[PDB]
Design a protein around this nucleic acid. Sequence first.
DNA 1: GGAAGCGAAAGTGTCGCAACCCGAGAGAGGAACGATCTCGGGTTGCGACACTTTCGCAACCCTTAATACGTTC
RNA 2: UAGUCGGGUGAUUAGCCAGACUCUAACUUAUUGAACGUAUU
Length: 157
Amino acid sequence: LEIKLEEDLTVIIGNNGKGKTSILYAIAKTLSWFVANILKEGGSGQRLSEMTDIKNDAEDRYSDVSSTFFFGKGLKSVPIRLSRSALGTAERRDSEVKPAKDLADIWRVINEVNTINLPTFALYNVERSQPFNRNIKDNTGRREERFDAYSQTLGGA
DNA sequence: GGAAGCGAAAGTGTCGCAACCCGAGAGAGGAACGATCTCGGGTTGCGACACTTTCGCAACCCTTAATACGTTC
RNA sequence: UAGUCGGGUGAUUAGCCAGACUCUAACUUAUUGAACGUAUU
Ligand SMILES: Nc1ncnc2c1ncn2[C@@H]1O[C@H](COP(=O)(O)OP(=O)(O)O)[C@@H](O)[C@H]1O
């Protein structure tokens, strides 16, 4: 499947069990690498599940999620591919996440040398709408500091 | 293909809390014996969370290259 | 309207001017090797 995401707003519609949540999940997994390498040099983002994400029928028992990002005329393409092979497969497929690491390295290094505006990556899935608020004191890393905005940003809730 | 570090993802154990049970005990009433509410352990079920295991990113570039100037794979 | 093509001007990778295109839809890449162009030859 291929999609042509719009620059400002894209709406995905369909019946139940058509793959809209799957598309959002794949995009969030792709953005996790950008978030991780912004927070942490050479950081590891999320990866495709080897138990559920690969198509049940399949022909090669592996799945790929290719994404291309635009960052102006100076960087017209940032290709990142997430790949995973199914359980019990001799040949394992690797992911091509280097350009995302390079772009996030640019962001992080420039920001530390001189403060810049950082991009926002958020996922609001069905795990939202959970009851209650402020369940625990949540000793988690000083919400005041700037890089706390990337904590659990693509978790769904 | 995959050091060395490290973190994601998934599975499993554990451990504390709640909920209840059960015997002991001082003693309400009203004229005695012991109702009834509480104290102190003890057991079980459960779920959040810690702990455990596996995978995968991607150093280096091996003895072993050539060195007019440009695109392309 | 975008976006794209690129003829001109421009101390010139920028800015501007004229013109044109639109399958749902480019993202310019890699050497010393191979071939191509060019220069010595
Ligand atoms: N690994 C898989 N192989 C084949 N079909 C799958 C797999 N995982 C999910 N599906 C199917 O694809 C659909 C996934 O649903 P989902 O992506 O949440 O769609 P939506 O948000 O449109 O309801 C369901 O119909 C599910 O049965």
